Amino acid sequence: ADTIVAVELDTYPNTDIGDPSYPHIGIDIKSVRSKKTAKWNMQNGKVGTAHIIYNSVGKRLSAVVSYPNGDSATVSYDVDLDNVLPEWVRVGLSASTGLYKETNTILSWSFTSKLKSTNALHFVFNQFSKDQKDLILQGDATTGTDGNLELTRVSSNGSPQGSSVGRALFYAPVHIWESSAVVASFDATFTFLIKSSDSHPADGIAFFISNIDSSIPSGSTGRLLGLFPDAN
Amino acid sequence: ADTIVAVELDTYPNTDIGDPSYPHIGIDIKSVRSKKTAKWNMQNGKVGTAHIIYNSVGKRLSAVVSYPNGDSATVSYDVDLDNVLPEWVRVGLSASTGLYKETNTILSWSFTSKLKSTNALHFVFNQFSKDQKDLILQGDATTGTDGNLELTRVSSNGSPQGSSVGRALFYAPVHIWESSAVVASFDATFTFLIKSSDSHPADGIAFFISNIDSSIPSGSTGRLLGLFPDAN
Amino acid sequence: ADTIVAVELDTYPNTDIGDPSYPHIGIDIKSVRSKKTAKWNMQNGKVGTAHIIYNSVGKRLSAVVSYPNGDSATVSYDVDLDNVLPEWVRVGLSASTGLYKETNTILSWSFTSKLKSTNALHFVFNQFSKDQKDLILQGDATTGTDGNLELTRVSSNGSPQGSSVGRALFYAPVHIWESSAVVASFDATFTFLIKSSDSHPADGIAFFISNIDSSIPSGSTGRLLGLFPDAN
Amino acid sequence: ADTIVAVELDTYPNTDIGDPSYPHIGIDIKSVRSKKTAKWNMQNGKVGTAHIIYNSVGKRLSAVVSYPNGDSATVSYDVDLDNVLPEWVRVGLSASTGLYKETNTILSWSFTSKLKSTNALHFVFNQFSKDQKDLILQGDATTGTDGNLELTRVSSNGSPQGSSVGRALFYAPVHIWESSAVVASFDATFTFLIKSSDSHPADGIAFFISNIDSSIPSGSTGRLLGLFPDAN
Numbered sequence: 049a050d051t052i053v054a055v056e057l058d059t060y061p062n063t064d065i066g067d068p069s070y071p072h073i074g075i076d077i078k079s080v081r082s083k084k085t086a087k088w089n090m091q092n093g094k095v096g097t098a099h100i101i102y103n104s105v106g107k108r109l110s111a112v113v114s115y116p117n118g119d120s121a122t123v124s125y126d127v128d129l130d131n132v133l134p135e136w137v138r139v140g141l142s143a144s145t146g147l148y149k150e151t152n153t154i155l156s157w158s159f160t161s162k163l164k165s166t167n168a169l170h171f172v173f174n175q176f177s178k179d180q181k182d183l184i185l186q187g188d189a190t191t192g193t194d195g196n197l198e199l200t201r202v203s204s205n206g207s208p209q210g211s212s213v214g215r216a217l218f219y220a221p222v223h224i225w226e227s228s229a230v231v232a233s234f235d236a237t238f239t240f241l242i243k244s245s246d247s248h249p250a251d252g253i254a255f256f257i258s259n260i261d262s263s264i265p266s267g268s269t270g271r272l273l274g275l276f277p278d279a280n
Numbered sequence: 281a282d283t284i285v286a287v288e289l290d291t292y293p294n295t296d297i298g299d300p301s302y303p304h305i306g307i308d309i310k311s312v313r314s315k316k317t318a319k320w321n322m323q324n325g326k327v328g329t330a331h332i333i334y335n336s337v338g339k340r341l342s343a344v345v346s347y348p349n350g351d352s353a354t355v356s357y358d359v360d361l362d363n364v365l366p367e368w369v370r371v372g373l374s375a376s377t378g379l380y381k382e383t384n385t386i387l388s389w390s391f392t393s394k395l396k397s398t399n400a401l402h403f404v405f406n407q408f409s410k411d412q413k414d415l416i417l418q419g420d421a422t423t424g425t426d427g428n429l430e431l432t433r434v435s436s437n438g439s440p441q442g443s444s445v446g447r448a449l450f451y452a453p454v455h456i457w458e459s460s461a462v463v464a465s466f467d468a469t470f471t472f473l474i475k476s477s478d479s480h481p482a483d484g485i486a487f488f489i490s491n492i493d494s495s496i497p498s499g500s501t502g503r504l505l506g507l508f509p510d511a512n
Numbered sequence: 513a514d515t516i517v518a519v520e521l522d523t524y525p526n527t528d529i530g531d532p533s534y535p536h537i538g539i540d541i542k543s544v545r546s547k548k549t550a551k552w553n554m555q556n557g558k559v560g561t562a563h564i565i566y567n568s569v570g571k572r573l574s575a576v577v578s579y580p581n582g583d584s585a586t587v588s589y590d591v592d593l594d595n596v597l598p599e600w601v602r603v604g605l606s607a608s609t610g611l612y613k614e615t616n617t618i619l620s621w622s623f624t625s626k627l628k629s630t631n632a633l634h635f636v637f638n639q640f641s642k643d644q645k646d647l648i649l650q651g652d653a654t655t656g657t658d659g660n661l662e663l664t665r666v667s668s669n670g671s672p673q674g675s676s677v678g679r680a681l682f683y684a685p686v687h688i689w690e691s692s693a694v695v696a697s698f699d700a701t702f703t704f705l706i707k708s709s710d711s712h713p714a715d716g717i718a719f720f721i722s723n724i725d726s727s728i729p730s731g732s733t734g735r736l737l738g739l740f741p742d743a744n
Numbered sequence: 745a746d747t748i749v750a751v752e753l754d755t756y757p758n759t760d761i762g763d764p765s766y767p768h769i770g771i772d773i774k775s776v777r778s779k780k781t782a783k784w785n786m787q788n789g790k791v792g793t794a795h796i797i798y799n800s801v802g803k804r805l806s807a808v809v810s811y812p813n814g815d816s817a818t819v820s821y822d823v824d825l826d827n828v829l830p831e832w833v834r835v836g837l838s839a840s841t842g843l844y845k846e847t848n849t850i851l852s853w854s855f856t857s858k859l860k861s862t863n864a865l866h867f868v869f870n871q872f873s874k875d876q877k878d879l880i881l882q883g884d885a886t887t888g889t890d891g892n893l894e895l896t897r898v899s900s901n902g903s904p905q906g907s908s909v910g911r912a913l914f915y916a917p918v919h920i921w922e923s924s925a926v927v928a929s930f931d932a933t934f935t936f937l938i939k940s941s942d943s944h945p946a947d948g949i950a951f952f953i954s955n956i957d958s959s960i961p962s963g964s965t966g967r968l969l970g971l972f973p974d975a976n
């Protein structure tokens with residue numbers, strides 16, 4: 049079982065498994081049931097931006113998701129990730145569809161991690177490439193040539209597939225914490241466009257950090273968001 | 281009365297005015313009595329590093345101060361600075377001595393602020409100059425040519441003066457928050473060397489943010505750290 | 513007489529004063545007649561991006577201007593700016609109109625300077641503010657609230673004024689070179705939209721570096737681009 | 745045959761194979777015989793810093809190497825790397841010893857590449873780790889726990905081995921050029937300590953860029969610097 053820490057943009061309420069009963073953003077620490085959630089008005093067909101911010105000092109993992117009309121959800125959760133993550137992780141984006149579906153389109157992704165006492169990794173993808181050799185693609189995720197990362201299967205005619213799951217992880221392992229670093233901080237930002245014409249968009253996109261070998265857990269579509277093998 | 285938000289490295293306990301009764305780092309929101317403090321073992325003659333981290337999402341202003349042997353104090357305080365600071369501020373470093381004294385030597389200072397929806401300001405001074413035209417010097421603060429910023433008066437023979445106060449503020453106003461920014465974050469880092477041979481080092485160094493016109497408040501040496509006119 | 517180094521996006525040929533006889537980008541070292549120019553197809557009403565790159569090692573000041581259809585002009589000029597600029601400068605953007613006119617609209621501006629042996633200044637304005645306290649506005653230049661910097665006068669009805677000149681300089685002096693720095697580098701980027709319906713767009717926008725007190729030289733509209741008092 | 749572009753800090757004159765007949769820094773484009781060299785006074789046992797700067801606009805690859813007493817060599821070479829490198833490369837550091845030997849100790853390494861029209865990769869290693877999962881180590885190169893990268897074999901007693909070669913490449917492929925990028929720039933910086941007590945230090949350290957699969961070419965010690973299979 050991979051270790052996962054994730055911010056999820058959860059477009060579909062599986063109130064079954066402790067989602068709230070609206071779309072939400074949530075902070076997931078080793079479980080798809082978020083330790084914390086905030087109501088989130090997904091704007092179908094609109095390009096949102098999620099920011100994810102943590103530092104080892106404040107020990108508060110925060111996320112905001114907003115859209116251009118300014119509507120914003122925020123969630124923060126106090127957690128010492130040193131006690132959750134392995135020292136080295138990969139960072140990634142993950143998305144799933146289920147019985148309902150949506151595009152899970154990432155227009156851009158950036159990430160920074162810093163260990164200060166400085167080691168640092170920053171990458172930014174404002175355009176994705178067809179053969180993006182720094183991105184590890186999993187499940188239905190593809191990139192290129194519209195400059196996008198399609199986390200889940202879209203069809204030839206621009207149509208969000210159901211029953212879909214994919215992720216992209218930055219190629220280089222990140223050293224997310226180092227026990228002598230006085231500050232270990234990361235931030236990530238991604239811009240996304242979730243569009244659906246279905247009866248309910250589902251299921252969402254997550255930014256995640258995981259052990260360096262993480263892969264899509266089996267049957268992790270719809271509600272499990274490609275991050276966890278199950279709903280515990 | 282200037283508006284001040286500050287992280288203070290407070291080397292001397294004025295338990296009189298609610299210091300704890302040890303040296304401490306503290307978070308000051310509009311008052312020299314810190315909303316929050318942490319015990320701090322000042323290492324005389326050793327070069328410490330303070331990091332200060334805030335973002336409008338987590339709304340938690342955090343500071344750590346460490347030294348090379350790894351000893352560290354941290355303090356964090358939950359505060360929405362949008363409700364404390366003016367939209368535009370200057371950022372600065374401040375230090376004072378009183379009846380006791382110390383060097384308040386800044387070897388480096390860096391700062392970053394970002395407003396994302398990005399506007400950003402980053403500066404870094406790993407060496408200060410004699411005529412440092414981007415730094416507004418106040419009170420006893422001088423820079424150049426040892427590459428240092430002497431926040432307070434030192435004497436020709438390397439001797440920390442008593443009864444001393446100075447600050448350096450970055451020349452450009454910073455736009456610390458902007459009501460449409462989805463994330464307003466700042467961080468600052470400075471490295472310092474507080475040395476004294478006196479009976480007690482005093483009084484400390486602060487990183488502060490203030491209205492753009494802030495100046496040293498009158499008689500703000502020793503305990504008031506050059507930040508506030510008084511101890512309320 | 514201010515010292516000026518500039519990259520000019522020169523929309524109008526004053527073949528009179530050694531412009532080439534097409535619009536051009538040029539590198540200006542202390543003179544409006546560029547030491548170097550490249551043909552430039554200004555795309556009326558289109559948002560272009562200029563990048564300006566120099567480092568004290570290669571001693572080559574380079575500029576490219578491009579537009580989204582990919583059309584690009586480049587100009588580079590080998591120059592040791594240590595021998596041209598004062599150690600401290602301000603950096604700015606400048607634009608003018610003459611008998612012909614255009615919008616000189618800056619949508620974004622970023623700048624970085626670094627002195628390594630590191631001191632560094634980076635700012636980025638992806639949105640300008642009405643009361644932009646880190647930007648020194650000169651001549652007709654205004655900012656806010658469309659998020660733009662209007663270097664020259666526009667009229668209430670969106671109309672580019674003739675006979676116009678303005679600039680914006682970053683508030684903080686920059687330390688552009690330091691004789692012990694092993695590398696002194698800067699880069700700047702700005703995005704602009706030059707639009708005109710006139711018979712000929714004129715006259716252009718420049719990014720410039722100048723002594724810290726630089727102001728618009730008298731009658732520096734049209735061809736002189738707000739940078740020089742005359743055409744020598 | 746790997747494609748290599750490298751800046752070499754060449755401590756030993758193999759005037760045999762067109763080294764100049766002093767230690768030098770050189771720019772290597774697909775050949776160990778530098779297209780360009782500059783005399784370089786290696787300071788035995790002193791910690792030098794090399795900066796490497798290229799951008800697709802100026803098309804000038806520049807390097808300076810300096811030491812703290814200020815002594816500096818520079819070399820620049822005009823080259824359009826788009827025509828030399830594959831679109832995706834790895835970036836690395838390489839070092840060798842021969843009949844003579846030296847420490848090839850890297851204290852820090854940073855790299856940035858940017859494709860603007862922005863994609864970007866920046867990493868910085870100011871401390872290396874024992875199990876540095878973002879660094880691909882080759883030949884004798886080891887890292888950890890003194891915080892250093894030992895490109896070549898050192899012996900238990902701090903002794904630079906002869907006949908040694910190693911490299912470290914950043915784990916993630918870098919996208920060094922992209923035919924729509926208006927500016928493709930990179931820079932790299934590393935700090936190193938070359939120490940020897942031998943009759944002549946040899947042979948040097950290079951920063952290099954190569955195809956993503958590059959490995960040490962066979963018998964690439966001493967003069968070939970771990971970069972090329974031979975001296976053509």
Ligand SMILES: Nc1ncnc2[nH]cnc12
Nearest residue numbers: 061062063064065270271
């Ligand atoms: N509404 C729902 N809640 C929880 N789990 C589900 N799996 C499928 N539909 C679900």
Ligand SMILES: Nc1ncnc2[nH]cnc12
Nearest residue numbers: 293294295296297502503
């Ligand atoms: N110990 C102390 N506590 C508080 N204020 C003081 N002013 C001078 N000495 C002091």
Ligand SMILES: Nc1ncnc2[nH]cnc12
Nearest residue numbers: 525526527528529734735
């Ligand atoms: N065509 C032109 N060339 C040079 N200077 C000018 N001033 C006005 N028009 C001009």
Ligand SMILES: Nc1ncnc2[nH]cnc12
Nearest residue numbers: 757758759760761966967
């Ligand atoms: N001096 C030298 N010059 C060139 N190649 C060599 N190989 C070994 N020694 C050499």
Ligand SMILES: [Ca+2]
Nearest residue numbers: 058060062271
């Ligand atoms: Ca769900």
Ligand SMILES: [Ca+2]
Nearest residue numbers: 290292294503
């Ligand atoms: Ca005190």
Ligand SMILES: [Ca+2]
Nearest residue numbers: 522524526735
């Ligand atoms: Ca002209």
Ligand SMILES: [Ca+2]
Nearest residue numbers: 754756758967
């Ligand atoms: Ca050699």
Ligand SMILES: [Mn+2]
Nearest residue numbers: 058067074082
């Ligand atoms: Mn959920």
Ligand SMILES: [Mn+2]
Nearest residue numbers: 290299306314
């Ligand atoms: Mn205190």
Ligand SMILES: [Mn+2]
Nearest residue numbers: 522531538546
């Ligand atoms: Mn011209």
Ligand SMILES: [Mn+2]
Nearest residue numbers: 754763770778
């Ligand atoms: Mn050589």
